[PDB]
Specification:
It is classed as hydrolase. The entry lists the keywords Ntn-hydrolase-fold, proteasome, evolution, hydrolase. It forms a dimeric assembly. The structure is a homodimer. Chain A is globular and about 70 Å long. In chain A, strand 5 and strand 6 form a beta hairpin. By secondary structure, chain A is of the alpha+beta class. The first copy, chain A, contains five helices and twelve strands. The relative contact order of chain A is 0.20. At the A-B interface, helix 3, helix 4 and helix 5 of A face helix 3, helix 4 and helix 5 of B.
Chain lengths: 235, 227
């Protein structure tokens, strides 16, 4: 199981993912599902992964292998891609190559920025094809997407501040954690600011984090408070 | 697709279900998924249904067939045995001729308190307690978070009905196989009769204001936590 979510905003991008993997509910482990590539001043990429761990690690391994083995121009890599659409296709080709090497249920959220254009955000499907984020729906979800969605559909906006969207995403995580046990803390969160080409704002939020626990209680109190203000249903 | 939810409370029971069926997203229809049986003063039963329409109607058909002509809903001594009557109808529906029927079965029989059950596809069932005073069948995920945060065993019947409609709204917005109208029934304790009943249409003014007010309140509450 997984829950990973990313936001695409006016001021930049916000990425977040849980760390829980399992081979049955009675056999669990912790794995970072957020990858980060960077050429200082030129480009930043963030990849969130969901699905089978063996399959997702194979896709990440292939991306890192082509970056390392620098010996060709025709084979495009993350660092040789001219724009983020072509960078998304590099990830797509890595998914297709991982299938061909010998179900395959890998889902990714891929985003960042390359110098000369705005920050862009994508969702990669199991087949290798992908879709780009727009202002109409300024976020993507992968893995367990249902528990966290209703708070995003009601509250989320494309003009949100990066820290504001980060708080909303943690409340989305909170709802997911309480109803799906295959999703689990800690949560890796990254904020990317537009035109910086660097990741300075990056936290790992542990299970014992007081802010997350106070934020969870505050939202539950505010909803109980709001619920009581609603007019009574006459029957 | 379906969303149906019921609450088991101190003052009684509350039931609700959507009406949308489909043979693919481009070919839809409307069917009542809440069945009601009653003997004046003796007993009352409510069955919410989810899953394949042919299979769910077959279960309801077998329940009504046995009542016309072996324990039935009206000959069952307690609500636990009444749940087993529904469970046997599920098993019989399978054996006559995949099969993914889920039900919420509740009511009261004279002698004991009102009780609420969830019937699984195999025929076996579980009973509601105060720890988790509700059941969900069909699309259960979108509607759950508001229930986990707000739901209480000592809720009022109208209060629980209001919470259920907010849970319906979030489900309707995200799962399109779920659809209005919504049928809602409130059963009061020791009455053995259904007076408080209502179909909420898609054009209903209260439900539209309920949806908008909840959206505004969550935006207000989030901006309050921001500062």
């Amino acid at each position: 199981g997984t829950y990973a979510v990313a936001f695409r905003l006016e001021r930049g991008l916000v990425f977040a993912a849980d760390t829980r993997t399992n081979a049955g509910v009675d056999n669990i482990a912790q794995y970072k599902k957020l990858q980060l590539w960077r050429q200082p001043g030129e480009r930043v990429f963030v990849l969130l992964s969901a699905g089978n761990l063996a399959a997702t690690q194979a896709v990440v391994s292939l991306i890192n292998e082509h970056l390392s083995q620098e010996t060709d121009d025709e084979v495009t890599t993350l660092f040789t891609a001219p724009n983020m659409y072509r960078a998304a296709r590099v990830v797509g080709d890595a998914v297709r190559e991982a299938r061909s090497i010998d179900g395959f249920n890998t889902n990714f959220i891929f985003g960042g920025q390359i110098k000369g254009e705005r920050p862009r955000l994508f969702q990669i499907y199991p087949e290798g094809n992908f879709i780009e984020a727009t202002d109409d729906t300024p976020f993507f979800q992968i893995g367990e997407h249902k528990y966290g969605k209703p708070i995003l559909d009601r509250v989320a906006r494309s003009d949100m501040r990066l820290g504001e969207a980060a708080k909303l995403m943690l409340l989305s995580f909170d709802s997911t954690l309480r109803s799906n046990l295959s999703v689990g803390m800690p949560i890796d969160l990254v904020i990317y600011e537009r035109d910086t080409f660097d990741v300075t704002r990056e936290k790992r939020i542990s299970a014992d984090d007081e802010y997350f626990r106070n934020l969870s209680n505050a939202w539950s109190d505010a909803l109980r408070q709001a619920f009581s203000k609603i007019e009574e249903f006459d029957v």
